[PDB]
Amino acid sequence: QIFVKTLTGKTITLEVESSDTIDNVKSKIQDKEGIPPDQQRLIFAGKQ
Amino acid sequence: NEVGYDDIGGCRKQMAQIREMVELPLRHPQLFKAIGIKPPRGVLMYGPPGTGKTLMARAVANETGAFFFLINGPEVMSKMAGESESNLRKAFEEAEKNAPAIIFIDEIDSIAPKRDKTNGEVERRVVSQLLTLMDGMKARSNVVVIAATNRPNSIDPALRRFGRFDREVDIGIPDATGRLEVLRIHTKNMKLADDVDLEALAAETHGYVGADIASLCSEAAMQQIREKMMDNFRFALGNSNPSALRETVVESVNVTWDDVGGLDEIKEELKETVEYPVLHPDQYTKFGLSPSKGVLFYGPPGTGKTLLAKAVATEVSANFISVKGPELLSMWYGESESNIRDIFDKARAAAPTVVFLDQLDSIAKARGGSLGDAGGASDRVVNQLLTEMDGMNAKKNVFVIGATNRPDQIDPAILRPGRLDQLIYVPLPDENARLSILNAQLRKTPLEPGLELTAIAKATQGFSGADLLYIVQRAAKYAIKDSIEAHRQ
Amino acid sequence: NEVGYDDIGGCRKQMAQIREMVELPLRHPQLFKAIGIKPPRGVLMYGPPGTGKTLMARAVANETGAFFFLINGPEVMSKMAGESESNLRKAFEEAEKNAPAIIFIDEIDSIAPKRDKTNGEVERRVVSQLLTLMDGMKARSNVVVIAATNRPNSIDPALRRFGRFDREVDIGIPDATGRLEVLRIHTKNMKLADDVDLEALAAETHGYVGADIASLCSEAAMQQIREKMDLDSLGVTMDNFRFALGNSNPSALRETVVESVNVTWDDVGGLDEIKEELKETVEYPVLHPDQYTKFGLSPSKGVLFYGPPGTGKTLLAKAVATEVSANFISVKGPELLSMWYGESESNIRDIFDKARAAAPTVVFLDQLDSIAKARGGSLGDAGGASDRVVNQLLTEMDGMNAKKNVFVIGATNRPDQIDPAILRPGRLDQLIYVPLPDENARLSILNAQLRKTPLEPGLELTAIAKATQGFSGADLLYIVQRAAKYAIKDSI
Amino acid sequence: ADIASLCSEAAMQQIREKMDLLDSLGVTMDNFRFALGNSNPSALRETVVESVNVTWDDVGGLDEIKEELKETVEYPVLHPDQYTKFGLSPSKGVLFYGPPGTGKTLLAKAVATEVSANFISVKGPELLSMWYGESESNIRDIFDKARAAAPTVVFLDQLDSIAKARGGSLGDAGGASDRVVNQLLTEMDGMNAKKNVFVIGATNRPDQIDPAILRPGRLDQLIYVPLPDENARLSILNAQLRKTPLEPGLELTAIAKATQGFSGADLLYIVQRAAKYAIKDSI
Ligand SMILES: Nc1ncnc2c1ncn2[C@@H]1O[C@H](COP(=O)(O)OP(=O)(O)OP(=O)(O)O)[C@@H](O)[C@H]1O
Numbered sequence A: 001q002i003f004v005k006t007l008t009g010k011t012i013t014l015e016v017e018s019s020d021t022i023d024n025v026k027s028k029i030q031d032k033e034g035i036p037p038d039q040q041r042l043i044f045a046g047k048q
Numbered sequence B: 001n002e003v004g005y006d007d008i009g010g011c012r013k014q015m016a017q018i019r020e021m022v023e024l025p026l027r028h029p030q031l032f033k034a035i036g037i038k039p040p041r042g043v044l045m046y047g048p049p050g051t052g053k054t055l056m057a058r059a060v061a062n063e064t065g066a067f068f069f070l071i072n073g074p075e076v077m078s079k080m081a082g083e084s085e086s087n088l089r090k091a092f093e094e095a096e097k098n099a100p101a102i103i104f105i106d107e108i109d110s111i112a113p114k115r116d117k118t119n120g121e122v123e124r125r126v127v128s129q130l131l132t133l134m135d136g137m138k139a140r141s142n143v144v145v146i147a148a149t150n151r152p153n154s155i156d157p158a159l160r161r162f163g164r165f166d167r168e169v170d171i172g173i174p175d176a177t178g179r180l181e182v183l184r185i186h187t188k189n190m191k192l193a194d195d196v197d198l199e200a201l202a203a204e205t206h207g208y209v210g211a212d213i214a215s216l217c218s219e220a221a222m223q224q225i226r227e228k229m230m231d232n233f234r235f236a237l238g239n240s241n242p243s244a245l246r247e248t249v250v251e252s253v254n255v256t257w258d259d260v261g262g263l264d265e266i267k268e269e270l271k272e273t274v275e276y277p278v279l280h281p282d283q284y285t286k287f288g289l290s291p292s293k294g295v296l297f298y299g300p301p302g303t304g305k306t307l308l309a310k311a312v313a314t315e316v317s318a319n320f321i322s323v324k325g326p327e328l329l330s331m332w333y334g335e336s337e338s339n340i341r342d343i344f345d346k347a348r349a350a351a352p353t354v355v356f357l358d359q360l361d362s363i364a365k366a367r368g369g370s371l372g373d374a375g376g377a378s379d380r381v382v383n384q385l386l387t388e389m390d391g392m393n394a395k396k397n398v399f400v401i402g403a404t405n406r407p408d409q410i411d412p413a414i415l416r417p418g419r420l421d422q423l424i425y426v427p428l429p430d431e432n433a434r435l436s437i438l439n440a441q442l443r444k445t446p447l448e449p450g451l452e453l454t455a456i457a458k459a460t461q462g463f464s465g466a467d468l469l470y471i472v473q474r475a476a477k478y479a480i481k482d483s484i485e486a487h488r489q
Numbered sequence C: 001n002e003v004g005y006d007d008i009g010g011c012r013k014q015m016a017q018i019r020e021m022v023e024l025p026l027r028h029p030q031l032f033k034a035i036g037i038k039p040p041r042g043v044l045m046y047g048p049p050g051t052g053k054t055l056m057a058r059a060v061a062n063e064t065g066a067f068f069f070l071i072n073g074p075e076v077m078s079k080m081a082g083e084s085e086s087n088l089r090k091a092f093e094e095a096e097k098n099a100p101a102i103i104f105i106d107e108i109d110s111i112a113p114k115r116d117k118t119n120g121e122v123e124r125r126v127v128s129q130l131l132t133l134m135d136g137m138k139a140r141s142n143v144v145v146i147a148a149t150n151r152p153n154s155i156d157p158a159l160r161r162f163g164r165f166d167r168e169v170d171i172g173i174p175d176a177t178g179r180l181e182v183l184r185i186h187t188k189n190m191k192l193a194d195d196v197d198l199e200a201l202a203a204e205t206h207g208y209v210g211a212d213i214a215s216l217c218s219e220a221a222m223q224q225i226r227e228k229m230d231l232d233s234l235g236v237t238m239d240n241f242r243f244a245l246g247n248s249n250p251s252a253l254r255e256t257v258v259e260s261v262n263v264t265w266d267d268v269g270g271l272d273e274i275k276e277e278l279k280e281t282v283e284y285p286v287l288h289p290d291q292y293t294k295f296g297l298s299p300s301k302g303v304l305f306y307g308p309p310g311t312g313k314t315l316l317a318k319a320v321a322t323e324v325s326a327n328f329i330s331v332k333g334p335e336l337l338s339m340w341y342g343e344s345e346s347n348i349r350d351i352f353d354k355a356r357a358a359a360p361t362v363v364f365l366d367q368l369d370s371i372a373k374a375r376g377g378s379l380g381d382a383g384g385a386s387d388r389v390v391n392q393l394l395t396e397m398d399g400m401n402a403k404k405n406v407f408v409i410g411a412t413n414r415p416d417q418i419d420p421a422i423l424r425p426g427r428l429d430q431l432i433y434v435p436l437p438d439e440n441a442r443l444s445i446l447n448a449q450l451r452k453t454p455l456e457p458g459l460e461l462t463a464i465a466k467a468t469q470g471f472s473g474a475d476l477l478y479i480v481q482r483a484a485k486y487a488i489k490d491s492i
Numbered sequence D: 001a002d003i004a005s006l007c008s009e010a011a012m013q014q015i016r017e018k019m020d021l022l023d024s025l026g027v028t029m030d031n032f033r034f035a036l037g038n039s040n041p042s043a044l045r046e047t048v049v050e051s052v053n054v055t056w057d058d059v060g061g062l063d064e065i066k067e068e069l070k071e072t073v074e075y076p077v078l079h080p081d082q083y084t085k086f087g088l089s090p091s092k093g094v095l096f097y098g099p100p101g102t103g104k105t106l107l108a109k110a111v112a113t114e115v116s117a118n119f120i121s122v123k124g125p126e127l128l129s130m131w132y133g134e135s136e137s138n139i140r141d142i143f144d145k146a147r148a149a150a151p152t153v154v155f156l157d158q159l160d161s162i163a164k165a166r167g168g169s170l171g172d173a174g175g176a177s178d179r180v181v182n183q184l185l186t187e188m189d190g191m192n193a194k195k196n197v198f199v200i201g202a203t204n205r206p207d208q209i210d211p212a213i214l215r216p217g218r219l220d221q222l223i224y225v226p227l228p229d230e231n232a233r234l235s236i237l238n239a240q241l242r243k244t245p246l247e248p249g250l251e252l253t254a255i256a257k258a259t260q261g262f263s264g265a266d267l268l269y270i271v272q273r274a275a276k277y278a279i280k281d282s283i
């Protein structure tokens, strides 16, 4: 004719937010992004 | 899609006061300038879900031509507590740009819960963003916010204080004429015949929420399609389950005061107490205190106690709290006195509403200073019964019935005018009441009129009415056997 | 479009008190020189919601032109990497860059409360960040911090110290014609008529901290525009405020009745002897408390009552809340009993802590047989027992100050379940059994109901009262309740 | 830190008086006396720091009982070498139990008049409020600090609300709150009489506590406070009527002669009504 009562407790979280390895950024630089319409980029030649 | 004002009814008394709350400050904002005060910003709605809470906001939006912004409850709160505060900042900024505008939100209990002992949720950073956003913006801007929820008491009390959500409306279940109006709306396109009824089809439902009317019409229409390779509405009630399935709002037995006979010292003595303050309260405010809540029923077993329980509950068409005898579940030591209090507060919210109990008088056995006793139940739950029964209010006029079969164990503190005081002995049905009970029960039987029940009343002298119900059951069970041996030959 | 010092009234004593600690460290700081001491920083406001805590904070900011700042409770509370500890010190250095400045932290109980529940989360290290931030404010006469909350007992007691947060002030309830000053502010912009009078509104509005008064004049404007079916002259009337009294609830959505049930002295039938003995209760020693210090003895602490049920243990129990209009509370017997075992001793603690904080107050008890339990727990064997609920109030009621208007009054029906130490002198002194009324007192029992109803004088008042030969005081209410449904009978 | 509040509040009080149309701002005695009234020490329902003790002849009689209490809180302080020369452990604990009325505080705080150290006590609200950890950890800083911050007297009361059902034959089944009777026993053998420690147990029911609290070696001295007789009840009425303008022409013995089963609470009950009608004569 009796009872059992017990509560609980929690811990939410911690974070660091660590990212961006160096090998991904070196591949991130050597690319293209697009050029409007007529914004050619050119070639050039010389030094015969 | 494109809904209007004439698509829903029942809450027309509340629909008129809504049209002066969200259309009058938007169409005429200069009327509040002449009176000086600011127009109200927040009005919320509640009730059972599926009475058209989301369809009501879309009806008044298309009938005004204003901007209609929508933020869903369980959608924007499921993010990682960083984009919800910017979505609410984007909500009020876009509504200010294209004024006049309304803002409809639904399921605000999922956004704004209450603070309780079970801490561990987020419960912050989103509703506090709504607090600092709503208290401003009142520089005669044509913007209003409309909230919608299911449980109106799980909301945080900081919202319903002042200036944020001050006006409330209670769109509940419709009446018998309310379901009759939505039956004509949902059957405007189905080519029915002349055999269907509308008043009898609405009266045979008696507990159906407005979302069921679209489902019950499509179930009967699908049955009519299947017979090609129109009274199929009664087939749809036997197949489909009504909404609010396993709650305390059950209504499936439609026994009225005609189907129950006799006991004229109880029918007029129940009309004196539970129909007079709920219909004519103008005389009760100048002739003492209004309500006569408690009433007791005692007598022999099977004397017709609960036969009149659902009969009075369907006369005024109010709610019927069907709490059984051992409903004090008593899983521990403290919740056994607490689970009886929220059902009393629910009776005050849905007032007037009849509450039923059975044999909960246990303070005569709860003597002081002994050894044989329980661990906190059946001796301290009567101390809660000595303080939660007379918790009355003049704006509710509730009433509670009580049926027992042992009037010798009545507590000396429960037979009091502050408790259930009106005790009425339910006697045996005499030779005049035996005909009034049994003839109303074989009304559904297509019987022959040669057999009169006066011979049954002469053969039953000390029989109860439930024992007479076995006689018409045995007469019907052998009429089934008379019908079984009629189609095989 | 900003508020000022004249924007809010009713708290004129607390306005002049709070104006000293903000103007003197900023306008004339030379008074703190050549006196040795340092000007304080923290001001603590606390009270019920709707009293105008954030209104008083914005009014003192715009009237001085200082660098006002705002720190919200649930906003700056992070779980990422301890960002709440970096954003509190970010707000302190930004307020230190501009002189003079003022910061405001509302709902300070939401940010790092007392550790009776959590005790292990990041909020233990959040409050200790606020300890070293306020104590490291060596910049004299630059930053003044004010705070606002609702419960001063849920906060950690480390804030109430010398350095960070001292000089607390309670924003009370404007009862001494303070609601007239609130009605003068809100109704000065609305168009008025000749029949209205603000003096005939504050006397009937008990409580009414100020937020519902602004809701009352707005709802009275809704009743005025309700009759317009739709160049315009509306005004107001006296019936609009009377419509807003009954058709709108006061601040009682949290608890149903805490103030009164609108009774008086002569609503209990008979019992003129207990009306004389009730004048030795808290009506007596409040207006003269120095006589007990002169006579060198503490007053009476508790009077106990027991007897037949229905003889005035709810009418006289709530008549004390009307004869002095003190800070009444309403608590039931097993409603104090909780479902958790550890809450069994702290639930009486917060009730008694509100009694010493709302002095003068009136408390009561009903059905102490569920609370006393003189055997001391029935069987045992469980994770929790029914023995700490009675052994805590017997010691906590002894550890109270005598000059703080604390007392108890009883209402029971069983004189055997109560413990002998419950009826101990010094805690519950006067063992007064309430009696059944005789034939000389049962005439005014029916007259308690006949005061408000227009009874015909041809009917004899003592003819119905002479049918009682040992009845109770509630039984004559059953006659007028039976007559409440027997008088009409033809008007349907 | 509270001593800095006493000087800074009296200067703030003085400038609230001197303010009209900086010449002389000497802080007066009444400014420090007002600062003692409106403010308070650090005891904001924390560990209590007070030494409220009464002198002798404040409990009536005791002419045969005062010699029984002088050998437990004075003689370990006045003569500590009598235990070190012999080798006996001094009894730092005395269980108290008696009739209603007196027994809790005025029969225990009148014993330690010569020490007057800080009194850190447990009481009613100091119980299991947090369900995790803070059940005996709030007592762990009482046991370990009693030998570090000596002298410190710890009073123990409400014995029927700590170890009633847990120490019995039936006990606790489930491990929910059986963590109360362990630290009260395992901190007894781990504590020696190196520094000045003192504990006092008082209750209304001595048989409702666990018998392991009355183990030998820690409670070998049992002092029983009896009911005050006719020779002591008359001096009770002269003790609780101390700060009163009492006329000496009356006989306080005639009031106490009608008290046989009436304890000191009923003596307090019969004297409170004499002060109710005394102020009513002035009314
Ligand atoms: N007047 C009316 N009363 C009840 N139901 C109606 C009415 N008019 C139409 N209905 C039907 O009921 C449905 C309305 O349900 P609704 O879209 O409001 O779901 P809900 O669960 O109430 O919304 P929410 O998700 O916001 O709770 C419609 O699909 C419509 O066919």
Ligand SMILES: Nc1ncnc2c1ncn2[C@@H]1O[C@H](COP(=O)(O)OP(=O)(O)OP(=O)(O)O)[C@@H](O)[C@H]1O
Binding pocket: B260, B261, B262, B263, B300, B301, B302, B303, B304, B305, B306, B307, B403, B404, B405, B429, B437, B464, B465, B466, B469
């Ligand atoms: N007016 C009446 N008089 C006698 N019997 C009736 C009457 N009306 C209905 N009955 C029959 O009696 C039964 C009522 O039983 P119910 O359990 O509600 O009361 P009861 O028989 O007194 O039971 P209990 O003794 O547990 O209260 C019904 O099944 C019904 O057929």
Ligand SMILES: Nc1ncnc2c1ncn2[C@@H]1O[C@H](COP(=O)(O)OP(=O)(O)OP(=O)(O)O)[C@@H](O)[C@H]1O
Binding pocket: B162, B163, C007, C008, C009, C010, C011, C048, C049, C050, C051, C052, C053, C054, C055, C056, C106, C107, C148, C149, C182, C185, C209, C210, C211, C214
């Ligand atoms: N002088 C005044 N005293 C009390 N109330 C006032 C006064 N002037 C206006 N009010 C009303 O009281 C309300 C002020 O409440 P406020 O906005 O401060 O809520 P609060 O709960 O105190 O703030 P917080 O959330 O910071 O605690 C306003 O809505 C206003 O209508």
Ligand SMILES: Nc1ncnc2c1ncn2[C@@H]1O[C@H](COP(=O)(O)OP(=O)(O)OP(=O)(O)O)[C@@H](O)[C@H]1O
Binding pocket: B386, B387, B416, B417, B418, C267, C268, C269, C270, C308, C309, C310, C311, C312, C313, C314, C315, C366, C367, C411, C412, C413, C445, C448, C472, C473, C474, C475, C477
């Ligand atoms: N002076 C009076 N004497 C007796 N009865 C009165 C008096 N004034 C009013 N009454 C009536 O008696 C009833 C008082 O009963 P009450 O609420 O005290 O029940 P109770 O059983 O005594 O309370 P409890 O549950 O605490 O025992 C009221 O409903 C009221 O109508």
Ligand SMILES: Nc1ncnc2c1ncn2[C@@H]1O[C@H](COP(=O)(O)OP(=O)(O)OP(=O)(O)O)[C@@H](O)[C@H]1O
Binding pocket: C426, D058, D059, D060, D061, D099, D100, D101, D102, D103, D104, D105, D106, D157, D202, D203, D204, D228, D236, D239, D240, D263, D264, D265, D268
């Ligand atoms: N010498 C004395 N003898 C008897 N009573 C006294 C004496 N001196 C004072 N008193 C009065 O008797 C009361 C003492 O009661 P006490 O606080 O001991 O209650 P108790 O029930 O004995 O304690 P416990 O709760 O530990 O059993 C005081 O309030 C005081 O006014």
